[PDB]
Ligand SMILES: *[C@@H]1O[C@H](CO)[C@@H](O[C@@H]2O[C@H](CO)[C@@H](O)[C@H](O)[C@H]2NC(C)=O)[C@H](O)[C@H]1NC(C)=O
Ligand SMILES: *[C@@H]1O[C@H](CO)[C@@H](O[C@@H]2O[C@H](CO)[C@@H](O)[C@H](O)[C@H]2NC(C)=O)[C@H](O)[C@H]1NC(C)=O
Ligand SMILES: *[C@@H]1O[C@H](CO)[C@@H](O)[C@H](O)[C@H]1NC(C)=O
Ligand SMILES: *[C@@H]1O[C@H](CO)[C@@H](O)[C@H](O)[C@H]1NC(C)=O
């Protein structure tokens with residue numbers, strides 16, 4: 073699962089079988105680290121109009 | 123069922139019968155109009171291609187479509203501030219009410235700013251405000267005028283209206299006692315000024331009660347601000363739809379641009395990407411077109427709201443149903459989320475009774491016509507009274523005029539015209 | 543910048559046309575934006591594929607243009623309707639509508655021709671040099687309450703006069719410029735004065 | 741600001757009429773260097789209100805103002821077939 077963004081610790085209550093999560097946009101916004109089983113939240117790197 | 127169009131009401135029409143109000147009430151009605159729309163902004167390239175260089179390069183093959191889309195949304199965003207300014211920024215000075223709210227019994231505490239509140243909103247404005255994507259390149263720009271600034275414009279308009287009537291909307295603000303201002307507004311609806319003064323206490327009480335009813339009506343009626351909520355819902359829905367379209371394949375192996383790029387080399391990846399660009403570009407064009415059409419509707423509403431600020435609030439209107447139902451006296455603007463609320467104060471005739479009438483009085487062989495009012499009979503005596511409020515005066519040469527003899531007017535009646 | 547409102551219309555349409563023309567230089571996935579180059583190089587079985595790409599792109603570009611012109615046309619129509627209303631009103635009559643025919647009390651208006659638009663010169667009456675007066679809702683005289691027929695009762699500090707509301711012109715209070723309704727015990731703020739009988 | 745981070749403009753306490761809008765009540769102007777400020781909504785004007793005081797104009801002026809409205813748009817015409825296919 074590839075992408076670009078900032079990884080932070082998640083406070084989401086993932087169930088034992090869930091590998092990643094999605095927001096209302098139906099895009100990945102959280103993943104389960106395949107080695108540590110730590111749940112990480114994914115947010116885009118700071119951006120905006122200039 | 124088959125819907126009713128209203129109760130039937132037969133008017134007791136005859137060639138010599140008139141109904142004249144012996145009383146009236148002060149009605150306050152609420153008109154709610156959209157003024158502005160959320161200033162959304164969509165980064166065309168980011169929406170379609172994210173941060174993919176390969177997609178961006180393909181997107182360039184479509185020419186300047188993204189420039190047009192970014193430009194169209196920018197144009198809307200600018201309009202939204204123009205709409206707000208046209209409605210609220212109609213006063214050059216910021217007027218303030220006096221420390222002592224003595225308006226002859228007229229209580230404006232529910233429409234004037236509440237000084238105990240950090241938000242500096244009126245009790246009613248506070249109620250109105252209580253009642254009523256980014257990661258995909260969909261951002262929202264703030265209004266130039268904040269809610270606080272809009273509230274300040276509104277309070278300035280209220281202060282002007284209360285202390286100087288409509289004069290501040292024409293030239294300099296000329297102070298006038300509120301009761302006297304209301305008397306002028308009574309004259310403006312064909313009701314003599316003595317009616318205001320003689321019933322000043324009653325009128326102030328009817329007004330104060332009506333305002334209290336407004337706050338309760340809004341509080342107990344969640345649908346009251348549906349007109350403003352509908353605007354919010356339509357735009358939120360449009361954005362949600364735009365975002366959801368990013369999950370569509372449009373014929374591609376995947377809606378996810380990164381998955382295509384991680385699996386395929388350019389010779390094949392470009393085909394799959396081209397399908398996503400076409401679909402996403404089309405989705406964005408659909409969104410922008412709908413926003414432009416919707417923006418036009420909001421603009422029209424804002425123009426109406428602006429007209430109802432110059433008229434209704436900064437002056438008394440003669441236009442029927444323009445400033446509420448009934449005979450317009452005055453209006454008070456209130457700030458609201460992306461819109462304006464007008465409290466229209468109208469004079470509503472009440473408790474009418476039947477009188478016998480005549481087009482003229484015959485006296486000394488001459489035909490006498492009323493100068494201002496109408497000739498009415500209570501069954502034994504003829505009087506002349508103002509048309510909008512029963513006030514039976516003795517018929518005299520000082521309230522009638524003469525034109526022609528008694529053999530011309532149809533329905534002319536014989537009576538005595540008193541000479542002082 | 544005074545005529546920016548008319549210049550903006552010209553600029554928006556000129557810009558739309560320039561954009562429409564520029565789109566003809568886009569490939570839209572084709573080997574060339576130039577239709578003649580495709581036809582000179584390829585035979586129909588392949589040329590049609592490249593042409594189809596240009597047709598889709600150019601047709602889409604033209605649809606975009608037309609849609610924007612229809613939306614823009616609606617805005618112009620609304621403005622024209624307002625301009626027409628301000629010709630019937632304002633110019634062909636005196637308006638009572640606030641800020642409709644300029645800021646101030648409308649007297650009259652004069653239309654002027656302009657490029658793709660109309661300019662209205664609104665002549666308004668603007669009150670100036672106001673001064674403070676003491677006022678009263680009524681005058682008490684002979685036990686009766688007298689109200690002004692047209693103006694307002696004002697005091698210059700020693701004498702009461704009746705004057706028109708929009709222009710100070712202090713007339714003697716007489717029975718010919720007042721009317722009587724009720725006694726002096728009803729009106730709040732009623733003051734004692736003499737009403738002259740000619 | 742609420743609009744974003746504004747760099748290069750000097751923020752001041754003095755409020756002026758809005759020149760270049762930034763957003764959220766903030767405007768910028770050239771005054772020399774570029775400054776940022778909270779926009780003024782106009783000068784304050786306290787009306788000398790009382791229950792027995794009226795102000796009456798002893799003079800007037802005749803003002804002429806200009807209102808400019810669009811009436812028409814350039815009557816463009818595009819030959820669809822020629823545009824697309826020459
Ligand atoms: C104007 O109306 C408000 C109510 O809308 C009055 O405020 C109330 O005053 C009573 C005392 O008479 C208190 O018991 C209430 O709690 C107050 N309510 C609120 C919301 O403040 C106010 O006193 C009136 N002002 C005048 C001059 O009559
Ligand atoms: C005109 O109508 C008003 C009400 O709209 C009357 O005032 C009410 O009179 C009743 C007594 O019959 C009181 O209980 C109410 O409290 C009064 N209301 C208010 C706001 O004061 C008024 O008396 C009527 N006048 C005439 C001539 O009928
Ligand atoms: C290997 O992965 C598992 C998770 O399935 C983890 O519990 C274990 O500690 C990992 N071992 C090492 C050496 O990383
Ligand atoms: C006038 O009299 C008619 C009956 O002839 C009645 O129906 C009508 O309601 C009366 N109108 C008023 C104001 O009393």
Ligand SMILES: *[C@@H]1O[C@H](CO)[C@@H](O)[C@H](O)[C@H]1NC(C)=O
Pocket residue numbers: 500501502503
């Ligand atoms: C009409 O008014 C006069 C004066 O108040 C009164 O004397 C007379 O009795 C009234 N007539 C009727 C039918 O009410």
Ligand SMILES: *[C@@H]1O[C@H](CO)[C@@H](O)[C@H](O)[C@H]1NC(C)=O
Pocket residue numbers: 137138532533534
């Ligand atoms: C009203 O109509 C009646 C006939 O029903 C007629 O006798 C009377 O003169 C008419 N009055 C007027 C004012 O027209």
Ligand SMILES: *[C@@H]1O[C@H](CO)[C@@H](O)[C@H](O)[C@H]1NC(C)=O
Pocket residue numbers: 484534535536
């Ligand atoms: C008024 O009186 C005259 C007599 O002077 C009479 O001829 C006429 O018919 C009367 N009109 C009415 C309406 O009674």
Ligand SMILES: *[C@@H]1O[C@H](CO)[C@@H](O)[C@H](O)[C@H]1NC(C)=O
Pocket residue numbers: 672673674788795
């Ligand atoms: C009326 O007097 C007040 C001072 O009490 C002053 O501020 C106001 O400007 C005066 N208005 C006029 C028209 O002179």
Ligand SMILES: *[C@@H]1O[C@H](CO)[C@@H](O)[C@H](O)[C@H]1NC(C)=O
Pocket residue numbers: 698699700701
């Ligand atoms: C009020 O006007 C009268 C008549 O012109 C004049 O005699 C009197 O002195 C004036 N009073 C004041 C205070 O100006």
Ligand SMILES: *[C@@H]1O[C@H](CO)[C@@H](O)[C@H](O)[C@H]1NC(C)=O
Pocket residue numbers: 730731732791792
């Ligand atoms: C104006 O208010 C004062 C109290 O400050 C009062 O004495 C006076 O009678 C009031 N005058 C009018 C016309 O209400």
Ligand SMILES: *[C@@H]1O[C@H](CO)[C@@H](O)[C@H](O)[C@H]1NC(C)=O
Pocket residue numbers: 682732733734
């Ligand atoms: C007017 O004069 C009467 C005495 O005739 C007096 O009772 C009343 O209070 C006076 N009113 C005023 C406002 O001075």
Ligand SMILES: *[C@@H]1O[C@H](CO)[C@@H](O)[C@H](O)[C@H]1NC(C)=O
Pocket residue numbers: 751752753
């Ligand atoms: C603005 O005022 C604040 C105090 O509220 C002060 O600390 C700041 O230095 C002032 N800035 C300027 C440009 O005057």
